Amino acid sequence: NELTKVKYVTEGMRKPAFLSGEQKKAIVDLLFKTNRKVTVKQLKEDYFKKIECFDSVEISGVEDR
DNA sequence: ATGAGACGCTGGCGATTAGCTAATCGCCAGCGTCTCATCTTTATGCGCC
């Protein structure tokens, strides 16, 4: 429910789009199932750059952590 | 062929004799703990019909 509004904006993307269903499961298995609690900075640095390899992330759904 | 009818110091004292709420104020109020769990609810932090 908290990951249904974590919106991802690619550096090449033209409009913000919420994370897709497979993307959510990817987030869960990579980070949300490894650490007790994941900060937004940690999700941005430890998932998007390792999987999507996006230069920068832009979250419009959760603040600080 | 006579013998009834016509009735007092009290009031103003003392002095017994007896008896009763009420107005003012002050005091002073059972309290001590812990455990255990149980749920809520609030402050801040995130979303558009």
Specify the experimental method: cryo-EM
**Number of neighbouring beta carbons within 10 Å of residue A27:** 20
As a whole number of angstroms, the distance between CA A62 and CA A6 comes to 7
CB A5 within 7 Å, strand B: yes
Cα A42 vs. chain centroid, distance in angstroms?
A: 9
Overall resolution, Å: 5.3
The C-alpha atoms of residue A18 and residue A38 are separated, in whole angstroms, by 19
Separation in Å: B28 C1' and A56 CA: 76
Question: How far is Cα A58 from Cα A40, in angstroms, rounded to an integer?
Answer: 10
Structure letter (DSSP) for residue A22: H
Q: Is the CB of A63 under 7 A from strand B?
A: yes
A2 Cβ within 7 A of any nucleic strand B atom? yes
